[PDB]
Amino acid sequence: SDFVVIKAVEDGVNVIGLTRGTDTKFHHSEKLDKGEVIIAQFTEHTSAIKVRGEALIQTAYGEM
Amino acid sequence: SDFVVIKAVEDGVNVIGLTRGTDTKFHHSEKLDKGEVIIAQFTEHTSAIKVRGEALIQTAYGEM
Amino acid sequence: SDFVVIKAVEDGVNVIGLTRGTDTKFHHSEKLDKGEVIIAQFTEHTSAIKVRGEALIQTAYGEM
Amino acid sequence: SDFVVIKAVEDGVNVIGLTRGTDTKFHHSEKLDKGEVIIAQFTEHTSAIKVRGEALIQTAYGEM
Amino acid sequence: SDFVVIKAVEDGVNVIGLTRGTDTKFHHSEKLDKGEVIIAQFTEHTSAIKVRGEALIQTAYGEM
Amino acid sequence: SDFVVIKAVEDGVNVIGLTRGTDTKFHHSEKLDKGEVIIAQFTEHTSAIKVRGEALIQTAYGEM
Amino acid sequence: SDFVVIKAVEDGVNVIGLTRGTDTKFHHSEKLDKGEVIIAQFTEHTSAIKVRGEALIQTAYGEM
Amino acid sequence: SDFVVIKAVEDGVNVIGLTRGTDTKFHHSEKLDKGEVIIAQFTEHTSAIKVRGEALIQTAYGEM
Amino acid sequence: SDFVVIKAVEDGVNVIGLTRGTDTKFHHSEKLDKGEVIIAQFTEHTSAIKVRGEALIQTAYGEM
Amino acid sequence: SDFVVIKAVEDGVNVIGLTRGTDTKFHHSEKLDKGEVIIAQFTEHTSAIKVRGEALIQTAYGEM
Amino acid sequence: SDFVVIKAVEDGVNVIGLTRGTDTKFHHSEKLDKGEVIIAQFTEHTSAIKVRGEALIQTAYGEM
Amino acid sequence: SDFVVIKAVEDGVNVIGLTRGTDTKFHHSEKLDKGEVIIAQFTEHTSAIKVRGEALIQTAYGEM
Ligand SMILES: N[C@@H](Cc1c[nH]c2ccccc12)C(=O)O
Ligand SMILES: N[C@@H](Cc1c[nH]c2ccccc12)C(=O)O
Ligand SMILES: N[C@@H](Cc1c[nH]c2ccccc12)C(=O)O
Ligand SMILES: N[C@@H](Cc1c[nH]c2ccccc12)C(=O)O
Ligand SMILES: N[C@@H](Cc1c[nH]c2ccccc12)C(=O)O
Ligand SMILES: N[C@@H](Cc1c[nH]c2ccccc12)C(=O)O
Ligand SMILES: N[C@@H](Cc1c[nH]c2ccccc12)C(=O)O
Ligand SMILES: N[C@@H](Cc1c[nH]c2ccccc12)C(=O)O
Ligand SMILES: N[C@@H](Cc1c[nH]c2ccccc12)C(=O)O
Ligand SMILES: N[C@@H](Cc1c[nH]c2ccccc12)C(=O)O
Ligand SMILES: N[C@@H](Cc1c[nH]c2ccccc12)C(=O)O
Ligand SMILES: N[C@@H](Cc1c[nH]c2ccccc12)C(=O)O
């Protein structure tokens, strides 16, 4: 139930969930536009999140 | 039992629950108007929340 | 056992419980008048609360 | 486990327990007079508390 | 094991336990005099405590 | 494992344990004299403690 | 595993364990002299401790 | 796993473990000399510790 | 549920998951470019993370 | 998993583990020299630690 | 799920996992170069981590 | 779960794990040189750690 908050500062920001398991592949890519926010949990299927494109990011450890 | 608070600063703000599971898709979109607030938990079915349109957002980590 | 506090600043404020489950719909709408307060927990049946009309709201994360 | 404290600033303050379950109705209404206090827990049967009439209210999140 | 402390500032203060269950009624009323204190837990049978007459009250949330 | 500390400022102070159960009665009354202290837990049998006569009392919530 | 610390400021200080159960009686009285300290836990058999004679006392809640 | 630290400020300090159970008696007495320290846990068999002779004592609650 | 945040200050930064088990090898290498971020959990399969190339790193213990 | 840290300020410092059980005896004595440190846990077999000779000691409660 | 962060200040830094068990031997040695970081957990197989060569190290207790 | 950090200030520092159980003996001695660090957990087999030779040591309780 750990999560991350991501706000796209500029258009065309991209958020990628990476599969948990022995295998590691991108299983979903959610596209974000200027101002749009996403709050994503880590889950049974997502053990890593990748962020392409200039965004603003909050995590338990702080702001990016 | 982790949640997010979202208040629409202007009209026509949109809040999107994304399915938990192997698959990731929008299963519900709740529409908000100027001033209206929504407090949403993450749940057995919602592992990520998306926010289209200019809103004010609180999360465990702070304000957006 | 997480909850929210909602006080109506003006008449005709509306508080909506949204069903927890695969489905998401309004199952109850409680109407509030100037000054009246409601303290509502999230529950086996309510995984999100919506607030129509100008209210004052406290949550774990702070005041709205 | 969670509770709320309510003190009636003026006469004829009213405190309403709302049933927990699929259904949501008032199951009890306890009447309070100037100065009288009530400390009420959320319970197996009460998942939301409503307060009609001008009162002073403490919750985990603070004073109202 | 959550409790409340109640000290009667003036004579004839009254402390009322209200039944936990589907039903809500007064099952015990303990009377207090000037200076006398009572420390009462919420219990399997008491889910709300009511205080008639001018008292000083401590709870988890603070003084009232 | 919750407890209360009670010190008699003057002679003839009285400390009363009240039965936990559907029933509520005094099951023990321990008498205190000037200076004497008692540290009492809440227990399987004591769900409320009453204090007659001018004492000094500490609880989790502070000094009385 | 809750405990209390008691130091006798003057001679002939007395520390009394009171039985936990439906019954409440003194089951042990340990005698303390000027300077002698005792650190006593609450236990399966002791649910209240009484202190006769001028002592200095620490508890979870503070100093006496 | 709660413990106490005892350092003898002078010679001939004495540390006494008292039996846990219905019965309460000294089962061990460990003797300390100027400077010598002992760190003692409460245990399945020791529910109270007594300190004869001028020592320096730390407990969860602080210094003596 | 422990995680690390890694942001590439310059192009061609590399993030390597190392297998948990008796054996220790690289099982995945995710490539990062200027600005791109990755939030990675430790998992059933990743017990150590290696970071090649000039990055900015947050962990529970702080910034690197 | 509670422990103590002991550093010998001068030569010939001695650290003694005392048996946990109904019986209480020295089962091990580890000898320390000027500068040498030992970090010792309390364990299934050691419920008290004794320190002969001038040492520096850290515990959960602080420095000695 | 306790871990250590290690960043090589200079080239040719070496990070060594030591086997948990009755036996203690080096089972893996991961080599680090100027700037490269490694975040390593203690695990079912690694109960001690050794760091040869000039590095910067974060642990639960702080920086070294 | 608990660990200690040890950095050798000078050459030829020695770190000794002592067996957990009724018996207490050295089962491993790991040698450290100027600058080399070791982070060691307490484990099913190590209930005490000894440090010969002039080192710098961090523990939960602080620096040595
Ligand atoms: N499938 C991998 C994905 C992953 C998680 N954390 C990582 C850190 C680095 C590289 C890959 C990963 C896993 O579940 O473990
Ligand atoms: N169905 C996905 C949805 C998701 C959660 N967190 C994410 C982060 C990134 C991308 C997708 C997701 C899941 O339950 O895991
Ligand atoms: N029925 C949905 C309701 C919901 C909860 N949180 C949300 C966030 C966004 C959209 C819908 C929701 C659920 O239980 O998950
Ligand atoms: N019967 C509903 C009552 C309720 C609790 N929280 C709410 C929030 C909004 C509206 C109704 C409710 C339930 O148990 O869930
Ligand atoms: N019998 C009710 C009493 C009660 C508790 N909290 C309340 C709040 C409001 C009204 C009634 C109550 C119950 O156990 O739930
Ligand atoms: N027998 C009652 C005693 C009690 C506890 N708390 C109270 C508060 C008010 C009045 C009575 C009580 C019970 O166990 O619940
Ligand atoms: N035998 C009583 C003793 C007791 C504990 N706490 C008290 C408070 C007041 C009076 C008596 C008591 C019991 O176990 O409960
Ligand atoms: N045998 C008693 C010893 C004891 C513990 N705490 C006390 C306080 C007072 C008097 C005696 C005791 C017991 O286990 O309970
Ligand atoms: N396979 C190893 C990987 C590892 C984790 N932590 C380490 C520290 C140092 C060296 C290797 C490791 C393990 O699960 O334990
Ligand atoms: N064998 C005793 C040792 C002991 C622990 N704590 C003590 C305090 C005082 C005297 C002896 C002890 C026991 O396990 O309990
Ligand atoms: N195999 C040993 C390794 C070890 C852990 N901590 C230590 C401290 C000192 C010496 C050796 C060790 C063990 O699991 O316990
Ligand atoms: N074999 C002993 C080692 C030990 C741990 N802590 C100690 C303190 C003092 C002396 C010996 C020890 C044990 O497991 O308990």
Numbering used by the authors:
A (entry chain B), B (entry chain A), C (entry chain F), D (entry chain E), E (entry chain D), F (entry chain C), ...: 7 to 70
List sentences quoted exactly from the publication behind this structure.
The L-tryptophan biosynthesis regulator, TRAP, present in several Bacilli, is a good model system for investigating determinants of the oligomeric state. The tryptophan RNA-binding attenuation protein, TRAP, possesses similar geometric features to other circular assemblies, being assembled of multiple subunits and containing a central tunnel. This modulates terminator hairpin formation and so downregulates L-tryptophan biosynthesis.
A short segment of C-terminal residues defines whether TRAP forms an 11-mer or 12-mer assembly. However, this work required deletion of the C-terminus to increase the subunit stoichiometry and we questioned if a more subtle mutation at the C-terminus could induce formation of a 12-subunit assembly. Finally, we show how the 11-subunit to 12-subunit switch could be induced by the point mutation S72N. From the structure of the S72N TRAP we see that substituting serine 72 for a bulkier amino acid, asparagine, does indeed introduce the necessary constraints to exclude the subsequent segment from the subunit interface. In this respect, exclusion of the C-terminus in S72N is achieved in a manner more similar to how exclusion is achieved in B. halodurans TRAP. To understand if the 12-mer state of the S72N TRAP observed in the X-ray structure, predominates in solution, we analyzed this protein by native mass spectrometry. The 12-mer state was identified as the dominant species in the mass spectra, as opposed to the wild type protein which forms 11-mers. For instance, we note that both B. subtilis and B. stearothermophilus wild type TRAP contain two flexible lysine residues at their C-termini that can contribute electrostatically to the overall stability of TRAP. To understand which of these two factors – C-terminus or oligomeric state – has the greater influence we compared thermal stability of wild type B. subtilis TRAP 11-mer with that of the B. subtilis S72N TRAP 12-mer, which still possesses the C-terminal segment but has it excluded from the subunit interface for steric reasons.
